[PDB]
C-alpha cells in the first residue's frame, strides 16, 4: 500500500513530499509533484549507475569506485553538460594528450 | 581612417543592426521551435534581445582580439573566436 | 540518526547490474548528486510558481522546470517517465 | 538577401568589430559571426518560448526574455 509501490518506483515518495513541504519553496504542494520528482531522480540515478557499471565491467573490475563514476560522467555529452561545474573527489582526469605532442 | 572610426564608435551607444532583418530572423527561429503556431512579439522584447546579442558579440570580439594579439598577429581569425569560446568553458562561450 | 539514499541506490544498482557492488565514497558521491539535483529542480519550480502569481507547486511546474534544466533527450525521457508514473499512480 | 540569415550584412558586423576594438578583419569572419549569433538566439528563444507557453499566452513578453537571460547567467538591467 506504499505510494512508491503504487507508482511503480523504488525511490521514496513520502520523504520527497516531506522535504518539499519543509524546504521553503511555496505555501502549498500538490499531489503529483513528489511522484514526478522521484521518477525523474530514479531515472537519472539508473542512467548514471548503468554507465558506471559498464565502465567498471570493461575495466575488468567488480566494484564501482569514484574513478568509474568520473569516467561515466565525462564520456556522455548531456551528463557532462549537466554536471559542468562539479568536482569529483579522487576521480582524476581523462587520458587526453594533445596530438601535436605525440609523434 | 580606421582609427577615427574606432574612436567614434567607442563613444556612441546606439544599436548597429537594423530592426527589420533582426525581427524576421527572430520570428523564423521562434516559429521553428513551436508546432507550426505563430506567436506574436512585443517591441520591447525584440529590443532587449537585440541589446543582449550585440553586447555579447562585442565582448566576444574583445576577447578574440586579445587572443589575436597574443598569437602575434593584427588580423582577426575564426580560430581566435573558437579558442575564446573554448576557454570560456561551455557556459559563457556558446 | 542521519538520512541518505543508500538503500534506494543499492536497489537501483541491483536492478541494473545484479552482480556488481559499490564502495562507500561512491555512495557518498551519489547522495551528493541526488541532493544537488533535488535542490536545483525545487528552486526552479519555486521561481516559476512565483513568477506567475501562484501559491501551489504542481506536476506542471515540475515538468516545466525539468524542461528548463535538462538538455534535450534527457528532458524528453524524464518527462516520459514522469507522466508515466503519474498516470500509473492516479489509476489506483 | 532572400535568406533571413543574410539580412545581417557585412557593414553591421564591421561596425560591431570596430566597436570591439578590432583593427583588421578577414573575409571568413562574417559566416562564423552569423553562426554564433544563431546559436545564441536559438538558446535564448527556446528558453523564452518555454516561459511563454508555461502560461496560457500567445504573445512573447520582454519579461520572458529577461527571465531566460537571467536563468542562463546574464542579467539585463534596462528593460526590467
Amino acid at each position: 500500500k506504499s505510494r512508491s509501490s503504487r507508482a511503480g518506483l523504488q525511490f521514496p515518495v513520502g520523504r520527497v513530499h516531506r522535504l518539499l513541504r519543509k524546504g521553503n519553496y511555496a505555501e502549498r504542494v500538490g499531489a503529483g509533484a513528489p511522484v514526478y520528482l522521484a521518477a525523474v531522480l530514479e531515472y537519472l540515478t539508473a542512467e548514471i549507475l548503468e554507465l558506471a557499471g559498464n565502465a567498471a565491467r570493461d575495466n575488468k573490475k567488480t566494484r564501482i569506485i569514484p574513478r568509474h563514476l568520473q569516467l561515466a560522467i565525462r564520456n556522455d555529452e548531456e551528463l557532462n553538460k549537466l554536471l559542468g561545474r562539479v568536482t569529483i573527489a579522487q576521480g582524476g582526469v581523462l587520458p587526453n594528450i594533445q596530438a601535436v605532442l605525440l609523434p | 581612417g580606421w582609427l577615427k572610426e574606432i574612436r567614434k564608435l567607442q563613444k556612441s551607444t546606439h544599436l548597429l543592426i537594423r530592426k527589420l532583418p533582426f525581427s524576421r530572423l527572430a520570428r523564423e527561429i521562434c516559429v521553428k521551435f513551436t508546432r507550426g503556431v505563430d506567436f506574436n512579439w512585443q517591441a520591447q522584447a525584440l529590443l532587449a534581445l537585440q541589446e543582449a546579442a550585440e553586447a555579447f558579440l562585442v565582448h566576444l570580439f574583445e576577447d578574440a582580439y586579445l587572443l589575436t594579439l597574443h598569437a602575434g598577429r593584427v588580423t582577426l581569425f575564426p580560430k581566435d573566436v573558437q579558442l575564446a569560446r573554448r576557454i570560456r568553458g561551455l557556459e559563457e562561450g556558446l | 540518526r542521519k538520512e541518505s539514499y543508500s538503500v534506494y541506490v543499492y536497489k537501483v544498482l541491483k536492478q541494473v547490474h545484479p552482480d556488481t557492488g559499490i564502495s562507500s565514497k561512491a555512495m557518498g558521491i551519489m547522495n551528493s548528486f541526488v541532493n544537488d539535483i533535488f535542490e536545483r529542480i525545487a528552486g526552479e519550480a519555486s521561481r516559476l510558481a512565483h513568477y506567475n502569481k501562484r501559491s501551489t507547486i504542481t506536476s506542471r511546474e515540475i515538468q516545466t522546470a525539468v524542461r528548463l534544466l535538462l538538455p534535450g533527450e534527457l528532458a524528453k525521457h524524464a518527462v516520459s517517465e514522469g507522466t508515466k508514473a503519474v498516470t500509473k499512480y492516479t489509476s489506483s | 538577401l532572400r535568406d533571413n540569415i543574410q539580412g545581417i550584412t557585412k557593414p553591421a558586423i564591421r561596425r560591431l568589430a570596430r566597436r570591439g576594438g578590432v583593427k583588421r578583419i578577414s573575409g571568413l569572419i562574417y559566416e562564423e559571426t552569423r553562426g554564433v549569433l544563431k546559436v545564441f538566439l536559438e538558446n535564448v528563444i527556446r528558453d523564452a518560448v518555454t516561459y511563454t507557453e508555461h502560461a496560457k499566452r500567445k504573445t512573447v513578453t520582454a519579461m520572458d526574455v529577461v527571465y531566460a537571460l537571467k536563468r542562463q547567467g546574464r542579467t539585463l538591467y534596462g528593460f526590467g
Partner: peptide
Amino acid sequence: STVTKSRRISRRPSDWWVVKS
C-alpha cells in the same frame, strides 16, 4: 555510441566550439 536500457543514444562530447554548416 551506446544504447542504455531505455533507447537513449549516449554520445561522446566530440566538439562544440566550431561552427558547423
